[PDB]
Write an enzyme that holds these catalytic residues in place. Structure first.
Site, short mmCIF file in Angstrom:
data_model
loop_
_atom_site.label_atom_id
_atom_site.label_comp_id
_atom_site.label_asym_id
_atom_site.label_seq_id
_atom_site.Cartn_x
_atom_site.Cartn_y
_atom_site.Cartn_z
CG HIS A 41 -0.37 -0.02 2.55
ND1 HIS A 41 -0.48 -1.16 3.31
CD2 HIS A 41 0.10 0.94 3.39
CE1 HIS A 41 0.02 -0.94 4.51
NE2 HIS A 41 0.38 0.32 4.59
N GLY A 143 1.99 4.87 10.02
CA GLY A 143 3.42 4.87 9.73
C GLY A 143 4.13 3.60 10.13
CB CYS A 145 2.44 -0.41 7.28
SG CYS A 145 0.76 -0.47 7.86
C1 LIG Z 1 -4.20 -1.29 4.01
C2 LIG Z 1 -3.69 0.12 3.90
C3 LIG Z 1 -4.33 0.60 2.60
C4 LIG Z 1 -4.10 1.05 5.02
C5 LIG Z 1 -4.11 0.46 6.42
N1 LIG Z 1 -5.50 0.56 6.77
C6 LIG Z 1 -5.96 0.35 8.11
O1 LIG Z 1 -5.32 -0.26 8.92
O2 LIG Z 1 -7.22 0.86 8.36
C7 LIG Z 1 -7.70 0.74 9.66
C8 LIG Z 1 -7.33 2.05 10.35
C9 LIG Z 1 -9.21 0.60 9.65
C10 LIG Z 1 -9.97 1.12 8.43
C11 LIG Z 1 -11.28 1.02 8.40
C12 LIG Z 1 -12.03 0.41 9.57
C13 LIG Z 1 -11.37 -0.05 10.62
C14 LIG Z 1 -9.85 0.05 10.66
C15 LIG Z 1 -3.20 1.28 7.32
O3 LIG Z 1 -3.43 2.41 7.60
N2 LIG Z 1 -2.02 0.62 7.83
C16 LIG Z 1 -1.11 1.39 8.66
C17 LIG Z 1 0.19 1.45 7.86
O4 LIG Z 1 1.10 2.09 8.29
C18 LIG Z 1 -0.97 0.80 10.05
C19 LIG Z 1 -2.32 1.07 10.81
C20 LIG Z 1 -2.58 2.54 10.97
C21 LIG Z 1 -3.34 2.64 12.30
N3 LIG Z 1 -2.94 1.41 13.10
C22 LIG Z 1 -2.31 0.45 12.17
O5 LIG Z 1 -1.88 -0.61 12.49
#
Ligand SMILES: CC(C)C[C@H](NC(=O)O[C@@H](C)c1ccccc1)C(=O)N[C@H](CO)C[C@@H]1CCNC1=O
Ligand SMILES: CC(C)C[C@H](NC(=O)O[C@@H](C)c1ccccc1)C(=O)N[C@H](CO)C[C@@H]1CCNC1=O
Lengths: 306, 306
Positions: A41, A143, A145
């Site tokens: 992503h 951040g 990931c």
């Molecule tokens: C797959 C990619 C496209 C984005 C991924 N999406 C995500 O996790 O959406 C969560 C917030 C969500 C969405 C909708 C409903 C419920 C939950 C993302 O943000 N990954 C980060 C990367 O750094 C680590 C996250 C950030 C917050 N905590 C983490 O571990």
């Protein structure tokens, strides 16, 4: 004596973290030899993350659109490919700090250390378990990931997890380093349902052996039980069933402490049926299920790495 | 989101561990520049450890009686001296992996990461607090002495603890890196009494702020309280008194979450008076007191090091 939730020493993995930036998005990469592994992503914008078509988005990117930074040094990208949910960026330079390593896909119930990183830099290290429902109870922010989870064997780092997302209840989901998710999750911005989570019975038993080794014996009863009768009670309290392979895995703890696996099962049965009367085991008021039998042996016998 | 007991990344300290052997006794040393720091009981035999006269025993030793090993490499000792309860072995060679560092003496209630080592090699890393009674609840075996505890600030490793012993109840005692013990303990083989241990109230509050930040808010009540009235209830339950400096330290968490320190004190009062009705906060059935306010900010805002 004493028993703590210990993580693996993180140095060998610290030397492998890099920052990967594709446009506005920045996350962590793992640099081993001349390849940087990172979540796919990174090529998304915020709008792309709802419904991404990753193959489409990667087609638009050149090698030069990936900014890879190791400390203050930019690594020149000379190739890129996508393997499931991870990107592999081939780079100019082999990482001279690459440890002996392997990529492994762990099983549910197995533990590993996570090195939580932001912008390619480490924030801290903690120990986690792959939950039966293929989530982990981590600590991850925006951040994070591309942070990875690992085990060490003497000198060999087994990488088993890369972080990709967070699920509605503050639990987390990710991939092995071939990009395949643990569990039925996808890298898409949506609330995704995790299965009901169950307790890792073999690990609870291992931790009860750790308690005994450390002198905290009050919960031991005089009874024994059969595997079958124990696994019935386990079902009622949402405990994974105990298999004979698990009984075998607990063998060395059982022989060290003098307490047959099945007699420990008797004691745990009582704990599940009667609770703990506001007592603690190893400082915990709950039964702990994130130490494997091997984790108990490592800590209680002082297994080292370098 | 999520909240875990995270240790500092251990790499900078891993590069400093060495093995020190004086006759039959082997323990860990810390190699910074051209000096190895290690506990002084390394010069003891088992018989000496009951009643040791360390000044006497060190008089008998030459530089060459200290075998210092960094990996497979023996470091040549060219001098030695004793500073309180630690030995300083001057060596041939500066450690090229020496980080920027400081020696600090922490206060009770402060946390740090321990890198548990055997034979100069790391076994694992965990986070600990200096208890009000100047013990730590560690995980240490025979051979662990000379393991150190540390904090990191960006690039600077603050060394604050070296391990020396275990006390009757499976708690542990040690020195700063000038060799002065935390608490009234001595490096002698005897059951030593620790003071009654109390709970670190400022840290419990910080952890309650961490819970709120992570969405676990059930315990918040509508009441407020005065510092004085809170500190009375704290006495009854063996909680350290909360000072205005502690209230100041919690200020940033208070402003981030919108909950005045004293209103959080009201909620904690209720928790102490009424217990938790078998609920958990951040996964814990007990109130946690080994996260400082700074630890909460680090983890919850993604502070990194390198
Ligand atoms: C797959 C990619 C496209 C984005 C991924 N999406 C995500 O996790 O959406 C969560 C917030 C969500 C969405 C909708 C409903 C419920 C939950 C993302 O943000 N990954 C980060 C990367 O750094 C680590 C996250 C950030 C917050 N905590 C983490 O571990
Ligand atoms: C001071 C020095 C002379 C020996 C020191 N003595 C010690 O701790 O005695 C304990 C067992 C004791 C004695 C009597 C009554 C109650 C308790 C020691 O062995 N330190 C090791 C060093 O590696 C680390 C220990 C080992 C076990 N766990 C640890 O942390």
């Amino acid at each position: 004596s004493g028993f703590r939730k210990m993580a693996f020493p993180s140095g060998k993995v610290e030397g492998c973290m890099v920052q990967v930036t594709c446009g506005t998005t920045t996350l962590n990469g793992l640099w081993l030899d001349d390849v940087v592994y990172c979540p796919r992503h990174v090529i998304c914008t915020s709008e792309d993350m709802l419904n991404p078509n990753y193959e489409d988005l990667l087609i638009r990117k050149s090698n030069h659109n990936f900014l890879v930074q190791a400390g203050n040094v930019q690594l020149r990208v000379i190739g890129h490919s996508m393997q499931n949910c991870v990107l592999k960026l081939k780079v100019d330079t082999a990482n001279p700090k690459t440890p002996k390593y392997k990529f492994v896909r762990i099983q549910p119930g197995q533990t590993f250390s996570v090195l939580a990183c932001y912008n390619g830099s480490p924030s801290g290290v903690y120990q986690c378990a792959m939950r039966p429902n293929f989530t982990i109870k981590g600590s991850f922010l925006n951040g994070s990931c591309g942070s990875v989870g690992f085990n060490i064997d003497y000198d060999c780092v087994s990488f088993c997890y890369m972080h990709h997302m967070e699920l509605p209840t503050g639990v987390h989901a990710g991939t092995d380093l071939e990009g395949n998710f643990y569990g039925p999750f996808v890298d898409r911005q949506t609330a995704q349902a995790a299965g009901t989570d169950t307790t890792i019975t073999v690990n609870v038993l291992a931790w009860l052996y750790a308690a005994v080794i450390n002198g905290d014996r009050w919960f031991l009863n005089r009874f024994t039980t059969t595997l079958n009768d124990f696994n019935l009670v386990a079902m009622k309290y949402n405990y994974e069933p105990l298999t004979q392979d698990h009984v075998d895995i607990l063998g060395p703890l059982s022989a060290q402490t003098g307490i047959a696996v099945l007699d420990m099962c008797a004691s745990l049965k009582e704990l599940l049926q009667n609770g703990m009367n506001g007592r603690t085991i190893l400082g915990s008021a709950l039964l702990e299920d994130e130490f494997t039998p091997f984790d108990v042996v490592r800590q209680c016998s002082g297994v080292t790495f370098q």
